[PDB]
Amino acid sequence: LYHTVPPAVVGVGGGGVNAGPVASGAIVGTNGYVITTLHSVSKLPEISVQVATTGGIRRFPAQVVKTIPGHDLALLKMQTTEKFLHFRMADVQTVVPGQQVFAFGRNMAGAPLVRQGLVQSADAPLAVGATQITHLLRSDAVYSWEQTGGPLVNAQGDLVGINIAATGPTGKVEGFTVPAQVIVSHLQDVV
Ligand SMILES: [Cl-]
Ligand code: NI
């Protein structure tokens, strides 16, 4: 699992040569489609996606294809002739409370991050700016702001959602997740 998921886990950030990921993202299409959190990219003048390879980190410019503001998601497209290993959208699954999940990300240096945890709720609200997002998952697999925008997966490596790190009233990092089904239904006008 920790061998076959990371290639589809990317870093997302601005276009500066000396800039690193400020969030994570999930490759969901062979021609370079990436799902990430909307608030992470919406104010970036230019978007660069950082991809792990056997030769080290490669960067690709990306454009926003579609915003999903009501769920704080963005669909990006990398501008490249290259093909990518990716999450299969047909393999997307739901999870239930108590089920073990794994939250993947990439840090500011391009290194992979993974944490496992349990689903703790399957219906939780979250406010992102002025948007009230509903029917999110909660899990303790999300421990770092750097995991935001990265994928939640089940033990089989199926994409189950996109993570959002939120702050509690006390500063404790709390883990939220947009269910992957939201991607499918809000993107039935692209690929
Ligand atoms: Cl929406
Ligand atoms: Ni919706």
Numbering used by the authors: 34 to 224
Give me lines lifted from the publication on this model.
Here, we characterize a protein called MamO that helps to initiate the formation of a magnetic mineral called magnetite in cells of the magnetotactic bacterium Magentospirillum magneticum AMB-1. Although predicted to be a trypsin-like protease, we show that MamO has lost its ancestral catalytic activity and instead gained a new function as a metal-binding scaffold. Two genes in the MAI, mamE and mamO, are homologous to the HtrA proteases, a ubiquitous family of trypsin-like enzymes that functions using His-Asp-Ser catalytic triads. It appears to have lost the ability to perform serine protease activity and instead performs two noncatalytic functions: direct metal binding to promote magnetite nucleation and activation of MamE’s proteolytic activity.
Although the MamO crystals grow in acidic conditions that disfavor metal binding, they could be soaked at pH 8.0 without affecting diffraction. We solved another structure of the protease domain using crystals soaked in NiCl2 at pH 8.0 and identified a metal binding site. Overall, the conformation of the protease domain is highly similar to the original structure (root-mean-square deviation of 0.17 Å over 184 residues), and it contains the unidentified peptide. Additionally, a single Ni2+ ion binds between loop LC and helix 2, with H148 and H263 directly coordinating the metal. We confirmed the placement of the ligand at this site using single wavelength anomalous dispersion (SAD) data collected at the Ni absorption edge. MamO’s di-histidine motif is highly reminiscent of the Zn2+ binding site in another trypsin-like protease, kallikrein-3, in which Zn2+attenuates protease activity by altering the position of catalytic triad residues H57 and D102. Taken together, our biochemical and structural investigations show that MamO binds to transition metal ions using H148 and H263, but that metal binding is not restricted to this motif. We conclude that H148 and H263 contribute to a metal binding function that is required for magnetite nucleation in vivo. Interestingly, H116 and D149 participate in a hydrogen bond on the opposite face of loop LC from the H148/H263 metal binding motif, suggesting that the conditional phenotypes could be due to temperature-dependent flexibility near the metal binding site. It appears that binding is insufficient and that the precise coordination geometry must be maintained, leading us to speculate that MamO directly promotes nucleation by guiding individual iron atoms into the magnetite lattice.
